[PDB]
């Protein structure tokens, strides 16, 4: 089924950007049909992605299969994963102090991305700040289609995706804290069973904590939809 394939000679691979599940993600140059070349990311060593068109969801540029003796091509995200970008924001090199409105925009971006995928009845199954990438224009898009992001009942529906989104909201609000400090992975199921949740971050609004807390209700049906979540975050952002 090769409607999305690209000729291998149009692609030039280069240095490593990160490590995915099945192999290395490399930087690359893709020669386009209009003659010009574009910087790309190439996972090495997709059917879902072909069906997606939305700003806050990573798109498929193509596929290549080189023979030795496959590679999925994706857009280059110049600031990398969101988790690592948040960590750097607490030091002094690349980005400055990120204000509250910019963190909410990251949350809104992800919510929009998930709203779209949720309407297609597509389940992410791995939503986290490390799986959210940063475009050259500072917009976030969800990508990659881990015990502390999985919900109670899942130990998967669209509401277990909502749980993981709440955890990702917490990650962004804490600027890259690992969830559940002083709690081990084996310990999680019982920690959640007794009704304990991620604690409210430091200088973080009650309105915001209400929203992320609502993602972790015991009953999946009590959680809000991504569209409900998206509006709550958008209106909270507007009130600053
Ligand atoms: C969630 S994912 O499935 O996308 N995934 C999984 C495996 O690890 C990959 C990863 C980690 S860090 C990184 C990256 C880092 C930089 N940086 C290099 C160091 O300085 C800042 C920019 C620049 C570009 C980068 N990636 C991309 O453009 C790109 N697009 C599409 C897939 N990957 N990529 C990402």
mmCIF file of C-alpha atoms and ligand atoms in Angstrom:
data_model
loop_
_atom_site.group_PDB
_atom_site.id
_atom_site.type_symbol
_atom_site.label_atom_id
_atom_site.label_comp_id
_atom_site.label_asym_id
_atom_site.label_seq_id
_atom_site.Cartn_x
_atom_site.Cartn_y
_atom_site.Cartn_z
ATOM 1 C CA UNK A 1 0.000 0.000 0.000
ATOM 2 C CA UNK A 2 2.559 2.624 -1.206
ATOM 3 C CA UNK A 3 0.558 5.796 -1.977
ATOM 4 C CA UNK A 4 2.673 7.885 0.496
ATOM 5 C CA UNK A 5 6.226 6.669 -0.384
ATOM 6 C CA UNK A 6 9.141 8.926 -1.425
ATOM 7 C CA UNK A 7 12.156 8.006 -3.622
ATOM 8 C CA UNK A 8 15.139 7.325 -1.327
ATOM 9 C CA UNK A 9 17.531 9.497 -3.433
ATOM 10 C CA UNK A 10 15.478 12.644 -2.547
ATOM 11 C CA UNK A 11 16.515 12.102 1.117
ATOM 12 C CA UNK A 12 19.896 12.897 2.721
ATOM 13 C CA UNK A 13 20.340 11.764 6.358
ATOM 14 C CA UNK A 14 22.597 13.363 8.974
ATOM 15 C CA UNK A 15 23.145 13.601 12.740
ATOM 16 C CA UNK A 16 21.116 12.050 15.571
ATOM 17 C CA UNK A 17 18.332 14.101 17.225
ATOM 18 C CA UNK A 18 16.994 11.523 19.680
ATOM 19 C CA UNK A 19 16.122 7.868 20.253
ATOM 20 C CA UNK A 20 12.671 6.484 19.481
ATOM 21 C CA UNK A 21 11.275 3.082 20.425
ATOM 22 C CA UNK A 22 12.397 1.143 17.315
ATOM 23 C CA UNK A 23 15.574 3.178 16.630
ATOM 24 C CA UNK A 24 17.285 6.551 16.218
ATOM 25 C CA UNK A 25 15.598 9.745 15.048
ATOM 26 C CA UNK A 26 17.978 11.541 12.665
ATOM 27 C CA UNK A 27 17.979 14.994 11.134
ATOM 28 C CA UNK A 28 17.689 15.048 7.355
ATOM 29 C CA UNK A 29 17.227 17.010 4.154
ATOM 30 C CA UNK A 30 14.269 16.228 1.882
ATOM 31 C CA UNK A 31 14.397 17.404 -1.750
ATOM 32 C CA UNK A 32 10.825 18.538 -2.521
ATOM 33 C CA UNK A 33 8.916 18.388 -5.818
ATOM 34 C CA UNK A 34 9.309 22.163 -6.289
ATOM 35 C CA UNK A 35 13.137 21.658 -6.346
ATOM 36 C CA UNK A 36 13.907 23.118 -2.887
ATOM 37 C CA UNK A 37 15.196 21.250 0.174
ATOM 38 C CA UNK A 38 13.538 21.086 3.587
ATOM 39 C CA UNK A 39 14.936 20.151 6.990
ATOM 40 C CA UNK A 40 13.234 16.980 8.263
ATOM 41 C CA UNK A 41 13.294 14.470 11.101
ATOM 42 C CA UNK A 42 13.629 10.788 10.149
ATOM 43 C CA UNK A 43 12.629 7.937 12.513
ATOM 44 C CA UNK A 44 14.481 4.727 11.553
ATOM 45 C CA UNK A 45 14.660 0.908 11.832
ATOM 46 C CA UNK A 46 2.559 5.920 10.016
ATOM 47 C CA UNK A 47 -0.753 4.564 8.647
ATOM 48 C CA UNK A 48 -2.485 6.497 11.453
ATOM 49 C CA UNK A 49 -0.562 9.693 10.701
ATOM 50 C CA UNK A 50 -1.535 9.716 6.990
ATOM 51 C CA UNK A 51 -5.192 10.234 7.970
ATOM 52 C CA UNK A 52 -4.381 13.425 10.078
ATOM 53 C CA UNK A 53 -4.506 17.105 9.084
ATOM 54 C CA UNK A 54 -4.502 19.544 12.042
ATOM 55 C CA UNK A 55 -1.995 22.244 13.193
ATOM 56 C CA UNK A 56 -1.536 20.732 16.690
ATOM 57 C CA UNK A 57 -1.039 17.164 15.378
ATOM 58 C CA UNK A 58 2.159 16.032 13.673
ATOM 59 C CA UNK A 59 1.708 15.271 9.965
ATOM 60 C CA UNK A 60 3.286 12.604 7.757
ATOM 61 C CA UNK A 61 5.653 13.940 5.065
ATOM 62 C CA UNK A 62 6.309 10.465 3.661
ATOM 63 C CA UNK A 63 7.944 7.028 3.925
ATOM 64 C CA UNK A 64 11.213 5.672 2.465
ATOM 65 C CA UNK A 65 12.515 2.104 2.296
ATOM 66 C CA UNK A 66 16.253 1.828 1.668
ATOM 67 C CA UNK A 67 17.627 -1.672 1.047
ATOM 68 C CA UNK A 68 20.878 -2.659 2.768
ATOM 69 C CA UNK A 69 22.763 -5.720 1.421
ATOM 70 C CA UNK A 70 12.131 1.634 6.540
ATOM 71 C CA UNK A 71 12.161 5.336 7.509
ATOM 72 C CA UNK A 72 9.223 7.582 8.472
ATOM 73 C CA UNK A 73 9.839 11.248 7.484
ATOM 74 C CA UNK A 74 8.385 13.901 9.839
ATOM 75 C CA UNK A 75 8.662 17.725 10.106
ATOM 76 C CA UNK A 76 11.655 19.177 11.980
ATOM 77 C CA UNK A 77 10.672 20.476 15.427
ATOM 78 C CA UNK A 78 13.486 22.922 16.262
ATOM 79 C CA UNK A 79 12.868 23.192 20.031
ATOM 80 C CA UNK A 80 12.443 19.412 20.427
ATOM 81 C CA UNK A 81 10.203 17.684 22.957
ATOM 82 C CA UNK A 82 8.254 19.841 25.416
ATOM 83 C CA UNK A 83 9.496 18.103 28.601
ATOM 84 C CA UNK A 84 13.152 18.902 27.863
ATOM 85 C CA UNK A 85 12.262 22.461 26.768
ATOM 86 C CA UNK A 86 10.563 23.007 30.147
ATOM 87 C CA UNK A 87 13.643 21.716 31.988
ATOM 88 C CA UNK A 88 15.920 24.131 30.075
ATOM 89 C CA UNK A 89 13.556 27.042 30.896
ATOM 90 C CA UNK A 90 14.646 26.760 34.566
ATOM 91 C CA UNK A 91 18.349 27.275 33.613
ATOM 92 C CA UNK A 92 20.148 30.025 31.568
ATOM 93 C CA UNK A 93 20.915 29.426 27.863
ATOM 94 C CA UNK A 94 18.155 29.058 25.227
ATOM 95 C CA UNK A 95 14.711 30.257 26.424
ATOM 96 C CA UNK A 96 13.912 32.915 29.061
ATOM 97 C CA UNK A 97 11.482 32.621 32.013
ATOM 98 C CA UNK A 98 8.250 31.228 30.538
ATOM 99 C CA UNK A 99 5.209 33.090 31.960
ATOM 100 C CA UNK A 100 1.873 31.506 32.941
ATOM 101 C CA UNK A 101 0.091 32.494 29.685
ATOM 102 C CA UNK A 102 2.717 30.706 27.552
ATOM 103 C CA UNK A 103 2.339 27.510 29.633
ATOM 104 C CA UNK A 104 -1.452 27.683 29.168
ATOM 105 C CA UNK A 105 -0.954 28.086 25.406
ATOM 106 C CA UNK A 106 1.055 24.817 25.418
ATOM 107 C CA UNK A 107 -1.851 23.214 27.292
ATOM 108 C CA UNK A 108 -4.394 24.714 24.860
ATOM 109 C CA UNK A 109 -2.323 23.553 21.845
ATOM 110 C CA UNK A 110 -2.232 19.986 23.203
ATOM 111 C CA UNK A 111 -5.972 20.131 24.022
ATOM 112 C CA UNK A 112 -6.724 21.217 20.421
ATOM 113 C CA UNK A 113 -4.518 18.407 19.097
ATOM 114 C CA UNK A 114 -6.311 15.897 21.306
ATOM 115 C CA UNK A 115 -9.773 17.346 20.553
ATOM 116 C CA UNK A 116 -9.108 16.618 16.857
ATOM 117 C CA UNK A 117 -7.818 13.067 17.473
ATOM 118 C CA UNK A 118 -10.692 12.433 19.912
ATOM 119 C CA UNK A 119 -13.282 13.327 17.218
ATOM 120 C CA UNK A 120 -11.671 10.775 14.849
ATOM 121 C CA UNK A 121 -12.090 8.227 17.728
ATOM 122 C CA UNK A 122 -8.318 7.782 17.706
ATOM 123 C CA UNK A 123 -6.661 6.850 21.007
ATOM 124 C CA UNK A 124 -3.120 8.178 21.633
ATOM 125 C CA UNK A 125 -2.210 5.682 24.439
ATOM 126 C CA UNK A 126 1.055 7.541 25.297
ATOM 127 C CA UNK A 127 0.359 11.231 25.985
ATOM 128 C CA UNK A 128 3.128 12.996 27.920
ATOM 129 C CA UNK A 129 5.241 16.165 27.692
ATOM 130 C CA UNK A 130 8.137 14.143 26.182
ATOM 131 C CA UNK A 131 5.771 13.126 23.327
ATOM 132 C CA UNK A 132 4.697 16.746 22.624
ATOM 133 C CA UNK A 133 6.977 18.545 20.155
ATOM 134 C CA UNK A 134 7.731 22.212 19.461
ATOM 135 C CA UNK A 135 7.415 23.815 16.030
ATOM 136 C CA UNK A 136 9.652 26.647 14.801
ATOM 137 C CA UNK A 137 6.787 29.134 15.522
ATOM 138 C CA UNK A 138 6.501 28.027 19.220
ATOM 139 C CA UNK A 139 3.251 26.053 18.681
ATOM 140 C CA UNK A 140 2.973 22.576 20.222
ATOM 141 C CA UNK A 141 1.789 19.465 18.387
ATOM 142 C CA UNK A 142 1.088 15.949 19.717
ATOM 143 C CA UNK A 143 3.262 13.108 18.386
ATOM 144 C CA UNK A 144 4.138 9.385 18.817
ATOM 145 C CA UNK A 145 1.043 7.350 17.970
ATOM 146 C CA UNK A 146 4.896 4.576 31.311
ATOM 147 C CA UNK A 147 3.041 3.785 34.549
ATOM 148 C CA UNK A 148 2.508 7.281 35.986
ATOM 149 C CA UNK A 149 0.418 8.545 33.022
ATOM 150 C CA UNK A 150 -1.953 5.521 32.879
ATOM 151 C CA UNK A 151 -5.372 5.710 34.577
ATOM 152 C CA UNK A 152 -6.902 3.460 37.273
ATOM 153 C CA UNK A 153 -9.360 1.525 35.081
ATOM 154 C CA UNK A 154 -6.543 0.740 32.573
ATOM 155 C CA UNK A 155 -4.781 -1.423 35.237
ATOM 156 C CA UNK A 156 -7.817 1.994 27.070
ATOM 157 C CA UNK A 157 -10.538 4.493 26.137
ATOM 158 C CA UNK A 158 -10.620 8.188 25.208
ATOM 159 C CA UNK A 159 -11.004 8.966 28.927
ATOM 160 C CA UNK A 160 -7.671 7.251 29.782
ATOM 161 C CA UNK A 161 -6.197 9.693 27.233
ATOM 162 C CA UNK A 162 -7.838 12.488 29.286
ATOM 163 C CA UNK A 163 -6.090 11.179 32.439
ATOM 164 C CA UNK A 164 -2.680 11.338 30.717
ATOM 165 C CA UNK A 165 -3.476 14.861 29.485
ATOM 166 C CA UNK A 166 -4.065 15.933 33.106
ATOM 167 C CA UNK A 167 -0.665 14.447 33.987
ATOM 168 C CA UNK A 168 0.869 16.372 31.054
ATOM 169 C CA UNK A 169 -0.833 19.579 32.341
ATOM 170 C CA UNK A 170 0.865 18.908 35.690
ATOM 171 C CA UNK A 171 4.244 18.383 33.942
ATOM 172 C CA UNK A 172 3.885 21.760 32.204
ATOM 173 C CA UNK A 173 2.747 23.536 35.399
ATOM 174 C CA UNK A 174 5.698 22.076 37.344
ATOM 175 C CA UNK A 175 8.079 22.811 34.425
ATOM 176 C CA UNK A 176 9.113 19.173 34.044
ATOM 177 C CA UNK A 177 8.745 17.417 37.416
ATOM 178 C CA UNK A 178 8.394 13.653 37.324
ATOM 179 C CA UNK A 179 4.844 12.783 38.537
ATOM 180 C CA UNK A 180 4.342 11.552 42.126
ATOM 181 C CA UNK A 181 7.554 12.485 44.005
ATOM 182 C CA UNK A 182 8.351 9.929 46.723
ATOM 183 C CA UNK A 183 6.192 7.280 45.008
ATOM 184 C CA UNK A 184 7.510 4.207 43.139
ATOM 185 C CA UNK A 185 6.029 2.714 39.948
ATOM 186 C CA UNK A 186 4.905 -0.572 41.557
ATOM 187 C CA UNK A 187 3.293 1.523 44.332
ATOM 188 C CA UNK A 188 1.102 3.588 41.902
ATOM 189 C CA UNK A 189 -1.984 1.348 41.609
ATOM 190 C CA UNK A 190 -2.554 1.295 45.397
ATOM 191 C CA UNK A 191 -1.658 5.015 45.721
ATOM 192 C CA UNK A 192 -4.440 5.799 43.222
ATOM 193 C CA UNK A 193 -6.801 3.128 44.696
ATOM 194 C CA UNK A 194 -6.905 5.040 48.018
ATOM 195 C CA UNK A 195 -7.859 8.265 46.151
ATOM 196 C CA UNK A 196 -4.521 10.124 46.121
ATOM 197 C CA UNK A 197 -3.703 12.330 43.119
ATOM 198 C CA UNK A 198 -0.903 14.625 41.863
ATOM 199 C CA UNK A 199 -0.508 17.514 44.312
ATOM 200 C CA UNK A 200 -1.168 21.137 43.395
ATOM 201 C CA UNK A 201 2.033 22.875 42.071
ATOM 202 C CA UNK A 202 3.594 25.926 43.766
ATOM 203 C CA UNK A 203 2.357 29.272 42.352
ATOM 204 C CA UNK A 204 -0.408 27.583 40.345
ATOM 205 C CA UNK A 205 -4.015 28.754 40.221
ATOM 206 C CA UNK A 206 -6.919 26.904 41.843
ATOM 207 C CA UNK A 207 -8.871 27.270 38.574
ATOM 208 C CA UNK A 208 -6.086 25.479 36.698
ATOM 209 C CA UNK A 209 -5.766 22.760 39.345
ATOM 210 C CA UNK A 210 -9.554 22.202 39.190
ATOM 211 C CA UNK A 211 -9.204 21.459 35.455
ATOM 212 C CA UNK A 212 -6.294 18.976 35.749
ATOM 213 C CA UNK A 213 -7.853 17.338 38.846
ATOM 214 C CA UNK A 214 -11.062 16.699 36.852
ATOM 215 C CA UNK A 215 -9.008 14.521 34.474
ATOM 216 C CA UNK A 216 -8.234 12.070 37.306
ATOM 217 C CA UNK A 217 -11.730 11.247 38.633
ATOM 218 C CA UNK A 218 -12.118 7.533 39.461
ATOM 219 C CA UNK A 219 -15.067 6.997 37.101
ATOM 220 C CA UNK A 220 -14.010 7.612 33.462
ATOM 221 C CA UNK A 221 -17.465 9.008 32.603
ATOM 222 C CA UNK A 222 -17.057 11.756 35.235
ATOM 223 C CA UNK A 223 -13.999 13.162 33.387
ATOM 224 C CA UNK A 224 -14.522 15.996 30.842
ATOM 225 C CA UNK A 225 -13.998 15.578 27.089
ATOM 226 C CA UNK A 226 -11.033 17.199 25.315
ATOM 227 C CA UNK A 227 -13.419 19.792 23.834
ATOM 228 C CA UNK A 228 -14.737 20.658 27.324
ATOM 229 C CA UNK A 229 -11.109 20.827 28.515
ATOM 230 C CA UNK A 230 -10.051 22.953 25.559
ATOM 231 C CA UNK A 231 -12.725 25.615 26.238
ATOM 232 C CA UNK A 232 -11.898 25.737 29.966
ATOM 233 C CA UNK A 233 -8.209 26.319 29.197
ATOM 234 C CA UNK A 234 -8.947 28.887 26.456
ATOM 235 C CA UNK A 235 -11.240 30.949 28.738
ATOM 236 C CA UNK A 236 -8.808 30.679 31.679
ATOM 237 C CA UNK A 237 -6.066 31.964 29.362
ATOM 238 C CA UNK A 238 -8.284 34.877 28.219
ATOM 239 C CA UNK A 239 -8.874 35.951 31.859
ATOM 240 C CA UNK A 240 -5.253 37.113 32.496
HETATM 241 C C1 LIG B 1 7.496 12.430 20.228
HETATM 242 S S1 LIG B 1 8.322 11.863 18.725
HETATM 243 O O1 LIG B 1 7.803 10.595 18.354
HETATM 244 O O2 LIG B 1 8.354 12.943 17.792
HETATM 245 N N1 LIG B 1 9.882 11.568 19.229
HETATM 246 C C2 LIG B 1 10.245 10.220 19.738
HETATM 247 C C3 LIG B 1 11.760 9.951 19.767
HETATM 248 O O3 LIG B 1 12.468 11.132 20.166
HETATM 249 C C4 LIG B 1 12.326 12.241 19.264
HETATM 250 C C5 LIG B 1 13.120 13.436 19.717
HETATM 251 C C6 LIG B 1 13.563 13.596 20.966
HETATM 252 S S2 LIG B 1 14.421 15.137 21.055
HETATM 253 C C7 LIG B 1 14.071 15.422 19.359
HETATM 254 C C8 LIG B 1 14.500 16.622 18.614
HETATM 255 C C9 LIG B 1 15.434 17.447 19.237
HETATM 256 C C10 LIG B 1 15.888 18.587 18.601
HETATM 257 N N2 LIG B 1 16.818 19.383 19.286
HETATM 258 C C11 LIG B 1 18.247 18.999 19.224
HETATM 259 C C12 LIG B 1 18.890 19.623 20.474
HETATM 260 O O4 LIG B 1 18.590 21.037 20.528
HETATM 261 C C13 LIG B 1 17.208 21.448 20.524
HETATM 262 C C14 LIG B 1 16.541 20.836 19.290
HETATM 263 C C15 LIG B 1 15.396 18.911 17.325
HETATM 264 C C16 LIG B 1 14.468 18.092 16.697
HETATM 265 C C17 LIG B 1 14.012 16.931 17.321
HETATM 266 N N3 LIG B 1 13.037 16.079 16.772
HETATM 267 C C18 LIG B 1 12.201 16.298 15.731
HETATM 268 O O5 LIG B 1 12.229 17.291 15.046
HETATM 269 C C19 LIG B 1 11.193 15.294 15.405
HETATM 270 N N4 LIG B 1 10.098 15.519 14.612
HETATM 271 C C20 LIG B 1 9.393 14.358 14.573
HETATM 272 C C21 LIG B 1 10.059 13.471 15.357
HETATM 273 N N5 LIG B 1 11.139 14.065 15.863
HETATM 274 N N6 LIG B 1 13.401 14.411 18.887
HETATM 275 C C22 LIG B 1 10.857 12.685 19.202
#
